Amino acid sequence: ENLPWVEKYRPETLDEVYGQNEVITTVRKFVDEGKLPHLLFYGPPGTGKTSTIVALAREIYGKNYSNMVLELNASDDRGIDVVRNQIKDFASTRQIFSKGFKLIILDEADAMTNAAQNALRRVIERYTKNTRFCVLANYAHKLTPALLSRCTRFRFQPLPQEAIERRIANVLVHEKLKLSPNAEKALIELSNGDMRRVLNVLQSCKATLDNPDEDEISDDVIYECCGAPRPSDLKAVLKSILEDDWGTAHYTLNKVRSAKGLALIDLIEGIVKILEDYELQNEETRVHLLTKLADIEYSISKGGNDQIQGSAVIGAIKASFENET
Amino acid sequence: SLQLPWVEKYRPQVLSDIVGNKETIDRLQQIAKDGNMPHMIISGMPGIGKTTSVHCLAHELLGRSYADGVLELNASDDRGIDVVRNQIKHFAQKKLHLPPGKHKIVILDEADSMTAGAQQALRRTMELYSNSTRFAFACNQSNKIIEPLQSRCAILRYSKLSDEDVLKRLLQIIKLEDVKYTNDGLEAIIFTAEGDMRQAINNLQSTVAGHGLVNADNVFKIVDSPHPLIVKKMLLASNLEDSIQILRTDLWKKGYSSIDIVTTSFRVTKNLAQVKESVRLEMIKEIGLTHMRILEGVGTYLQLASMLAKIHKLNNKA
Amino acid sequence: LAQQPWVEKYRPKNLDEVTAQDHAVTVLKKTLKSANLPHMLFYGPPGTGKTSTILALTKELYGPDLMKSRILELNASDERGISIVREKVKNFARLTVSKPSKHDLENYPCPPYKIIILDEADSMTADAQSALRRTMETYSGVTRFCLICNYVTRIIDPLASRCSKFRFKALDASNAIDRLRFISEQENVKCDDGVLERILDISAGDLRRGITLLQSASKGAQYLGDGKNITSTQVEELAGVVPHDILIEIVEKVKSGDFDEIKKYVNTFMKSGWSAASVVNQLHEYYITNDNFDTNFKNQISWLLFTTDSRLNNGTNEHIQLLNLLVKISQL
Amino acid sequence: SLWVDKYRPKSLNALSHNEELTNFLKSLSDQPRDLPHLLLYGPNGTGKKTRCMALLESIFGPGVYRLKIDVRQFVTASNRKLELNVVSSPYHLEITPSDMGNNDRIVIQELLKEVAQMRYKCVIINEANSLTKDAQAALRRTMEKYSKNIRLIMVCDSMSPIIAPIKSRCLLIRCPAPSDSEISTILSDVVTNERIQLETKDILKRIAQASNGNLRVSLLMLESMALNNELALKSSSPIIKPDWIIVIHKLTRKIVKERSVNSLIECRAVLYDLLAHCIPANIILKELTFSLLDVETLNTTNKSSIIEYSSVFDERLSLGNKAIFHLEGFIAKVMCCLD
Amino acid sequence: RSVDIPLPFRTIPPLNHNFLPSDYESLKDKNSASCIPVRYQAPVLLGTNIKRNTTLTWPQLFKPVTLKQVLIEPKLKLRIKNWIETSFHTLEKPTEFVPLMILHGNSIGKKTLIQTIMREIAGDDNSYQIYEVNSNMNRSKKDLLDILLDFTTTHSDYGLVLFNDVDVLFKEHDRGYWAMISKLCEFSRRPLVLTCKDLSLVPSELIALASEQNSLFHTKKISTSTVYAFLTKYLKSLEIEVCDDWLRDVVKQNNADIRKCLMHLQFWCVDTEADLISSKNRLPVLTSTLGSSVKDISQLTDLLSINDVIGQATLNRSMVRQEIDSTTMTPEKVNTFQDQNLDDEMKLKFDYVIDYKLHLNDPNRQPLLPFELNIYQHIQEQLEARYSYVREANHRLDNEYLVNRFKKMTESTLNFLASRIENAEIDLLSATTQQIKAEINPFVFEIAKSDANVKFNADPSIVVRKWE
Ligand SMILES: Nc1ncnc2c1ncn2[C@@H]1O[C@H](COP(=O)(O)OP(=O)(O)OP(O)(O)=S)[C@@H](O)[C@H]1O
Ligand SMILES: Nc1ncnc2c1ncn2[C@@H]1O[C@H](COP(=O)(O)OP(=O)(O)OP(O)(O)=S)[C@@H](O)[C@H]1O
Ligand SMILES: Nc1ncnc2c1ncn2[C@@H]1O[C@H](COP(=O)(O)OP(=O)(O)OP(O)(O)=S)[C@@H](O)[C@H]1O
Ligand SMILES: Nc1ncnc2c1ncn2[C@@H]1O[C@H](COP(=O)(O)OP(=O)(O)OP(O)(O)=S)[C@@H](O)[C@H]1O
Ligand SMILES: Nc1ncnc2c1ncn2[C@@H]1O[C@H](COP(=O)(O)OP(=O)(O)O)[C@@H](O)[C@H]1O
Ligand SMILES: [Mg+2]
Ligand SMILES: [Mg+2]
Ligand SMILES: [Mg+2]
């Protein structure tokens, strides 16, 4: 059937989750003992927060997943009643013959309101003995300490390189796709530990591949599909600023941004990442470069004119590096 | 089955067991023994003993009459217009016989979430029927409750628990639970508690069930917050290049958001006793500048990198 | 009544009639005939032909009478993404699609799915992380999101996933003058040499600013009633650009180096009403592009212009900032 | 009322100085149908709002000057009684952004709603520069939506903080300050209507040169001197300045003559009295900076530092809340430099 | 590709985090002297009195037994006493006398004054029967006009109707409330009282009748010295000895409220061996020295100026989303009630309090919650703990000040220019506030000063004092 790869390669079992080893064993410890506290999963998106709880719920409930798991999203239509009424009806109504803990999965609860979070905490407190609550949110600082102190916190760290590489191998040898090692690395660095990014990019690469059975995806296809700046383009701008004339540096700055649709904020972040890998002779060079570029980036967000902001970036890099020379 | 959390297993049932705010608790004990409980609005930070104090006071006052003498309403229950005019008024007007000095208590927990209109309708309910029933309020923000309600109640502002108070109760818990511990392990729990005994118990309980012996290394593995010593090394590194490496690999690559890094950095800077009190204010100022940039929307890696450069410039220039 | 802004009076009516952008039309011709056009994004300089191209595709798809009804262009300005757009889209799409009209038959394909145009949808007070994404899952048979962005700095990868973006290159000099010259000829606008290039130089490649500037200049020429061609000074005035003669005096006072001499000139200049921001922009063009200064001078003056521009943007006294900038440049 | 308000040009023909703009505004009144959104900018006291009022009068009639005052009270999230005087008329409505603080975005979006809900109504926005970037974007929302029924006229002394989208869709009109000869001509007509006895015509010229192009200041200076001297101005009549300018002038001398700690404490008390008299902080900083630069005992290096620290603290003043910290900080740095 | 930046590549050393338990001891919270308890003396109590061992609260234990004990000015006490006495004698005479008194103002005993007067009018507790209508019930025309008419139509007896908290009205729950009052104004032979805190909520019609009949009394707030004196007499009755510094402190924070203080005194005057509330902060080793060097001050003044910029930004940018109250009137709720299709069952679901000010809330800029990170306060508290004048500047010129000053200041200007030999009211307000603040008003003082110097225009002394 026609289905996205995100909805196709979801972990049905807890063994299919990669990159979250510490969370998986502790979660797998809770089921085997039988003691399961209220769960609070948070971290960067696409790290497998929903996949982990669904796999655990399927592992425990077996075929009773449909009648014992109720999934809620705070972002859709959910009033102060609709938040609680479906929860309170599911908690109050019991199957009698099924005395196991009923699980309620709350997705994107960071967008929930202050009083609703406090109301949810009292709802959780009321049904501790017969109901278990799982809360998912993107950011921990958006959650009140009243709700934080009730549910155990499990931070989902971004997926490492090894976790992405293993799942990449599964996709290629199953969907009949070939990935060059250079393109694989470029996708990994750009992914930033987000398998939702990885699966969607690979899906689009196959769609744009007119001959998927024989064409090998390279660096240019990945960068153009995702709209990310290539390292060569960033390196070309950096070397033009460092060792060329002011007029030529301005020419290369405007040409690269116009020919690739690259904003100055992305240019500054990429330059900082590239310059991080070089041993600057003087310590004050790094201090001035980081301080000046941060002020430029802050002023860009306020809505300044492009030409002056672009020249400030060239001046900051040129003046910082002359100090070490 | 399940294991009873030490938050609930060691909940104080008597007003004497509550530690912290010794002045306010002592007067509350006298009120329970004597009677004539005044209207109070207990305010303070979460998890310092606000709800527990009201429940203990109600239990010690009514005793056997607690089942039908207390109308407890929280955020989960409805506290709208109709409830105030009908349910609360009926409870206040109910003729309940109690020993002299005892009075019915209407516990409106989490009153900060109550609407202003409901509070206004509650003004004359507490004033007219104060002879037979009394009102107790617990909230996190005292300014959320309207002023005319505050003019009819004795406002009690619960404060942050001191390190001695939190440590004393933790000592009783580990002694009653036979918990192996060390001096550095308890210091980490007090550090992560921040005057929150509810968070101190949760960290202590998770350490025991997680890694057994309560070490500082074991504690900091479960709080899943940025490690204070990792942040301190980043903020006090002799080389800027080394500090940049610490931030990228141990904080940015591990998924810690810019808010948590700034919050941990400000927390560590506040307790940096090695540095002078003048430089400490400057380093806090740079963190304050960086925190402002994140709030506007600029919370990228460069802002945190510039914060380290400015802080390291302060140390080198000193 | 008869007046209509020239920015929309010369919008393309056919997809192939758009100026340049051969990359955009070639993929769009293939996509239009298959009738399955997915949700897509366009990125380019503000006013480079994003809203014009998508409407030209829209016009060739449905009927002009039916286009205004089937394609309800919900604006990020008029409606909020999760408040009003969210409420309207679920009402609009659940509302049964009106039957195709007759003039659609065998002339206009009319693929039944509704295109929901949102130009600069990220410009609102709230970000629809999945609310806009969810209605594509439920209403895939009708709802399409032909959104518009500006740069590669995307808001979210989810929702913005199965999208084939088109790199809307800014209009080159040759074609943009030709479109500018064509509009002037239709409206019999009298303009001497250099005006058409001057309008683009002020607009910096932008056409939306360029066509509106000509319309303001054309009205200004008619306002005088002298029957004379539009002058470059008139184009400079309506755009707030400081004249070159005033700027030349500014760069000569700082060359003298006298603090009092600069102070007196700024006092007279601030009474003229010319903005300091235009001076800083023009000082940036004069100093950076010039070959009479070393790298050290241009490196330091780049920060001085940037610092003055940042302060002049947050509502600061222009007399203090302009005097401070000119004095600091003098010490360089 | 005052001579500034009673000797007010109430028609396009009544305008005297800057004839080229007067012809431009007259040509705009020829076709009110296609009246674009206007952004009039220039120095203070140049007649920007007078020309806007005259332009609106030529479009509708004398009824535009029939102004009624409606007080609107609003409550924010922390219960501050925000009251705003919304000047209105049967043809146009006037608002002042710098009266609602940072809460201007909600009140601007609210106030424009009923005006659109109720052939077009012109809305005059005084000091449009003081609007935050959130409200300026919100203003751009209304221009692209309610252009059929709402025409926006923006008056601001500085156009630089205005965002680019507003500029690209608003007809930019510049109002240069009148010359000293033009101010004297206006004062000459003003003097004749009040029968003020002038010993020589140089008295009016000295008033014009002391106003720095501000017609309201020159009109107010002429009225104060004439009333003080029984409507008989002489060549030896001193030019009357407001007391706060004199106080600032005394403040500048104290900074230069005494560089110590107790002097700054006295300067802070002087600043408190000036702020208690409802004087805007930016005007205090601007006058204090230029008066300090006028001292002849300071060398070039000191003067460059005064304007540098003033520029730094002026940005801090616009981005701050309490002006006592920024104003004292500027003085403390100046005393730190002059030593 | 072929692009090689002319800088050597870096070989990042491995970073190892092996922390000794000794390093974990440095995590101990350093002693902060900024927080400063004062620990007032425990309340020395003596004797055994019945006034102390009571089942009633202290504010109602000291319920006034006569007119003298109420803390409302005796000037207005006599006027209200006269009207009620004349009302009962007038409404016993067949009848221009509208029984409506409005007792607005920020006073405290606006309800006990009516009760204490009514006790003296009859002299017997059973003789007077005051029907009090409070906000705890539904004060609608459908739910109260039936009961109130039978109470005020039939026929010693001394009956009065009290409408407390008349400014707190809900849109649906109190439907037809003002129409019911107008109905009661005509068909009733018993006096009516409506107390309030703001007169704007009362319709302008009912203000006119009260003003014409001299039944519109404004009870302003009383001085804190009188409240302080009254508390001393009260505490003497129970034989309570209290340090005068704390008793002065209690009156200040409670804004000279007799009910709030008596509630405050009741909790803190129990017989326990514990110190009192700190309240007022002692000096936390406060040394606001000159600092000798202006350079040291130039750093502190810059730090203060920067911190104000931080405080302006961060304070109204909260990460956790806070809701708007469902009872405050809002622009979205105003139009929601304008639809005729809204039935009764949902109008009650979202009912708002009737107000004269629209509550405008920004869903993106909201005040910070207490648990959120706030670095502005920590810098402010630390700076205020070592420099005294910083704390003075914290409450020197707030937003309420310099606005009522400007309003009063312009009124003197609008009265001076209108006294020459309507136009001035609108033409000044047409001028921008900044021009009024710095150009017009400073120059009007110059004109007014020259008027009294020779001793043309009139009334020059008013402007001079306003511009002291
Ligand atoms: N650790 C992982 N192991 C295997 N697949 C993963 C992992 N993390 C994410 N994915 C995949 O990436 C996608 C993310 O699905 P989700 O479970 O919704 O992730 P998520 O972390 O819950 O993101 P959100 O913000 O909650 S929607 C799915 O296709 C998963 O199969
Ligand atoms: N001072 C204290 N002494 C003893 N136990 C305490 C103390 N403070 C908190 N606790 C414990 O920590 C938990 C706090 O519970 P509550 O008092 O209900 O929290 P809270 O102070 O009301 O804050 P909330 O509920 O978030 S508004 C309980 O399990 C108590 O046993
Ligand atoms: N490529 C183009 N071909 C033809 N006319 C163009 C082109 N680009 C711009 N124009 C003209 O300029 C106007 C603006 O073009 P668009 O870019 O489609 O409008 P826009 O996208 O709404 O501008 P922005 O991005 O919202 S500021 C059009 O109506 C045309 O008159
Ligand atoms: N001498 C006194 N005079 C008046 N009231 C007193 C006195 N001593 C104590 N009180 C108390 O002060 C309170 C004032 O009366 P209230 O009815 O509570 O206030 P109010 O008249 O309703 O007006 P408010 O509080 O502004 S809504 C009552 O609770 C009295 O018991
Ligand atoms: N052309 C003119 N002839 C005579 N007086 C003028 C002219 N233009 C402006 N004025 C004077 O300026 C005053 C109004 O200034 P105003 O427009 O409020 O200043 P701004 O333009 O800074 O808002 C009027 O009192 C009027 O006397
Ligand atoms: Mg999910
Ligand atoms: Mg509580
Ligand atoms: Mg567009």
Numbering used by the authors:
A (entry chain C): 11 to 335
B (entry chain B): 6 to 323
C (entry chain D): 22 to 353
D (entry chain E): 2 to 119, 134 to 354
E (entry chain A): 184 to 278, 329 to 388, 398 to 663, 699 to 732, 769 to 781
Paper text:
By leveraging state-of-the-art cryo–electron microscopy (cryo-EM), we find that the architecture of Elg1-RFC is specifically suited to the unloading of PCNA. This report documents Elg1-RFC alone and Elg1-RFC bound to a closed PCNA clamp and to a cracked PCNA clamp at 3.2-, 3.3-, and 3.7-Å resolution, respectively. The shared Elg1-RFC among the three structures is highly similar with a root mean square deviation between main chain Cα atoms in the range of 0.5 to 0.6 Å. The first loop (LL1) is 57-residue long between Arg184 and Thr240, preceding the AAA+ domain and emanating from between the collar domains of Rfc2 and Rfc3 and wraps around the collar domains of Rfc3 and Rfc4, whereby the C-terminal half (LL1C) cross-links the A-gate (top right). Together, the Elg1-RFC A-gate is locked by the LL1 and LL2 loops into a closed and static state, which is unable to open to bind DNA. The Rfc1 collar domain contains five α helices, but two of the five α helices in the Elg1 collar domain have descended to form the Elg1 plug, with only three α helices remaining at the top collar tier. The structure of Elg1-RFC indicates that it cannot bind dsDNA in the central chamber or the shoulder binding site.
PCNA encircling duplex DNA is quite stable and is removed from DNA by the dedicated clamp unloader Elg1-RFC. The three alternative RFC-like complexes are formed by replacement of the large subunit, Rfc1 of RFC, with Rad24, Ctf18, or Elg1 (16).
